[PDB]
Every structure is written in C-alpha cells, then in structure tokens.
Design a protein around this ligand. Structure first.
Ligand SMILES: C[C@]12CCC(=O)C[C@@H]1CC[C@@H]1[C@@H]2CC[C@]2(C)[C@@H](O)CC[C@@H]12
Ligand code: NA
Lengths: 249, 9
C-alpha cells in the first residue's frame, strides 16, 4: 500500500540554496538575479525529481521535457509555499535558506502582489491542515496539470498517467477515513487548493516574461535554461496555446 | 542548449 508514498518521500529534493549575499543591501537587481539563479538550480532538481516519478518514463521523451517546462513555476511555488509554512509558519516567503523574503524584499522585488498570493497559498497549508503526504501527492499531480490545447505527442500515455496520480491522491485521502462523505469533502478542498496554484503561476509567468524582455535595462541576469524556457515555452502559455487543467470551473 | 545539456547529464 505505502509503495506510492514511499517513492514520493524517497525522491523528494533536499535543501537548495540560492547563493544570495545577505550582507549586501537589498536591490531589485540583486534580489531578482538571486531568484533567477535559484530557479536555475531548482530546475536541475525538478528535472531529476520528475524523471524518478512513478511511470514518468512511459511518457514520450518530448512530452517529458514539455510538462517540466510548462509546470516548473507552479511546482516551485507550491514547494516554496510548503517550506514557508513549515519553516516560518508562512510569515515570510522561504525561497531558500539564504533567500528569505520579508515585506521589505517583497516590495524591493517589485512583485509584492504576487508575493502576497504566494504567502496566501502558504497560509492555506495551515488553514487546511495539509499533511506531508497530501503535499507530496499534490505536488506530483502539479507536474501533469498544464498541457498544450493541441495535445501532447502521445496524449494517451499522459492521460493515463494523470489519471493514476489523481487516483493516488484519492487513495491517500481514503486512508485514514472510512466515511465516503468525508473523503469527498477533503478531495474537494485539495482540488480547490490545486487550482488556486495556477492563477498565481500565471502572474509569475507574465512577470518573469516582462522581466526577461527588459532584463538588460534593469541589470537583472537570467541563467541559460531560464532564459530559454521563458522565451520559448512561457510565451506559449501566456498566448493561450498551453493551458492549465482545472478541476473546477 | 543548456537545457539539453542538463537533460543529458
Ligand atoms: C520559481 C522561483 C524560484 C524557486 C522558488 O522557490 C519559487 C520562486 C517563485 C518566483 C520565481 C523564482 C524564479 C525566478 C523568477 C521566475 C523571476 O524571474 C520572477 C519570478 C521568480
Ligand atoms: Na527548449
């Protein structure tokens, strides 16, 4: 029974630092350059994590890369939200041990409204008493929550994979529950929570896209993979060619 | 590309 959960717990990424100089004065360029670097570093971990997920290899190679490239933002925000909840009870955004955002940095980063939503998401982990197991399963499901409207190379293997991950999330809920009405209510809350991640990720997508375009003008550096994915994949999302899969309407 | 590089690794 614990087979699926054993795996998710086993492959969960450890701590990742951003390499931020917390002894230097906060500035838009410094903060954003550190966040971009952190994205580059976490992307490497997301790639190795995803590749180890049950059944991930069933997907066509090109789709494997695709889902990672479309979902990285939501995945990273979700996990960051969890770190914040567990490390500082959502009081600040715990991006990395060396990059913790307080209200001041939220303002200097010029993405205060987005940070607020992320902190709100972080608060939900508490307001809903999300278990470490529900967290893991929901995070896995977020990798299979955004695809092009024209479908993937092999849409069939993906649908099968997404369906099984929904089944696993349903299994976890029905675990310490014998009441079918309680399970339905918990599933409703979790799916609602999962959906709330997409609007936040889209705001970050728009923001990083605009920032990439004018990076040379604000002294903000974008690592190589980030620059590539944000100029090639993110636009497909912003233009509506690639869309999130919502549980509710 | 860097991504392709990392994917190969
Ligand atoms: C994904 C990251 C970095 C990893 C993380 O913990 C979540 C956080 C959310 C905001 C992202 C940031 C990476 C760099 C971005 C994309 C900046 O360009 C603007 C928004 C930033
Ligand atoms: Na690419």
């Amino acid at each position: 029974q614990p087979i699926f959960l054993n795996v998710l717990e086993a492959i969960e990424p450890g701590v990742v630092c951003a390499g931020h100089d917390n002894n230097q004065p906060d500035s838009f360029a410094a903060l954003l350059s550190s966040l971009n670097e952190l994205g580059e570093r976490q992307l490497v971990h997301v790639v190795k994590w995803a590749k180890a997920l049950p059944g991930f290899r069933n997907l066509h190679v090109d789709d494997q890369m695709a889902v990672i490239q479309y979902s990285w933002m939501g995945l990273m925000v979700f996990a960051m939200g969890w770190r914040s909840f567990t490390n500082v009870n959502s009081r600040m955004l715990y991006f990395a041990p060396d990059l913790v955002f307080n209200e001041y940095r939220m303002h200097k980063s010029r993405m205060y409204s987005q940070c607020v939503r992320m902190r709100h998401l972080s608060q939900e982990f508490g307001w809903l008493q999300i278990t470490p197991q529900e967290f893991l399963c929901m995070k896995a499901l977020l990798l299979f929550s955004i695809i092009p409207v024209d479908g993937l190379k092999n849409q069939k293997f993906f649908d099968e994979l997404r369906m099984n991950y929904i089944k696993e999330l349903d299994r976890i809920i029905a675990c310490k529950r014998k009441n079918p009405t309680s399970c339905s209510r918990r599933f409703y809350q979790l799916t609602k929570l999962l959906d709330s991640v997409q609007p936040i990720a889209r705001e970050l997508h728009q923001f990083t896209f605009d920032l990439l375009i004018k990076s040379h003008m604000v002294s903000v550096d974008f690592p190589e993979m980030m620059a590539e994915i944000i100029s090639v994949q993110v636009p497909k999302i912003l233009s509506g060619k690639v869309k999130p899969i919502y549980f509710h309407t | 590309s860097r991504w392709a590089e990392v994917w190969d690794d």
